[PDB]
Amino acid sequence: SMASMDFPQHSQHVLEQLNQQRQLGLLCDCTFVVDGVHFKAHKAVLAACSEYFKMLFVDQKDVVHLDISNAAGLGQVLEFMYTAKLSLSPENVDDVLAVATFLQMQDIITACHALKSLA
Amino acid sequence: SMASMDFPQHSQHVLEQLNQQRQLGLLCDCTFVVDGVHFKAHKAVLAACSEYFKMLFVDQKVHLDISNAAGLGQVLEFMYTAKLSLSPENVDDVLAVATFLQMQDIITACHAL
Amino acid sequence: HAVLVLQPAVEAFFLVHATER
């Protein structure tokens, strides 16, 4: 008859599929090139994780030109977007914090602040 | 490295933001029009949830054998909200769309009821 | 009994030099 059902592992499963598409460049409408290093991603996932990309792809206005401080910092930001996990080291936290601050991703900023305070 | 930061509520947040995009017709490259009603979606989300849409998007370039908009609506609601609402008025319409798109997680859900 | 309109896909490339001053 009538019933409602919830699949708690569905969000993580879709994100893992979105990650595998990105690692293989499948259905990717966005490609970043930072000094030879390339990064393919989905514009819908970028706008879902970063308010900067939201105002760049959706609102199309009132956005400062893209500025990526470190290529390795951008890879960790995209890795967090598609895996919800972010590896942080005392030799890369500042580079990840630079890209995250420009992209207005307070979740990574809080994660970077957690490592410098809770080493 | 020396530490790994995990965000358990991230994938739920991404799916909710993707749902808000398809509900507002934002950053969507798909448009389902079945019996006069329009449905927006992302081709990357469809391939991530349906093996039929996967093969249709990673290998191929459309008319679908979708019986009714109500069954497609609830199927799209499951993709973007992880929740499936079934009632005796739509369980047959949902299973029809679920079997064509080859999503046995939904197929088994309605096979019981 | 159904239509699926797919918008054409053009790739958005963003080529940037790193600002590691």
Automatic annotation (TrEMBL), chain C:
Give the transmembrane region(s).
none
Top-rank taxon:
Eukaryota
- The name on file for this protein is HECT-type E3 ubiquitin transferase
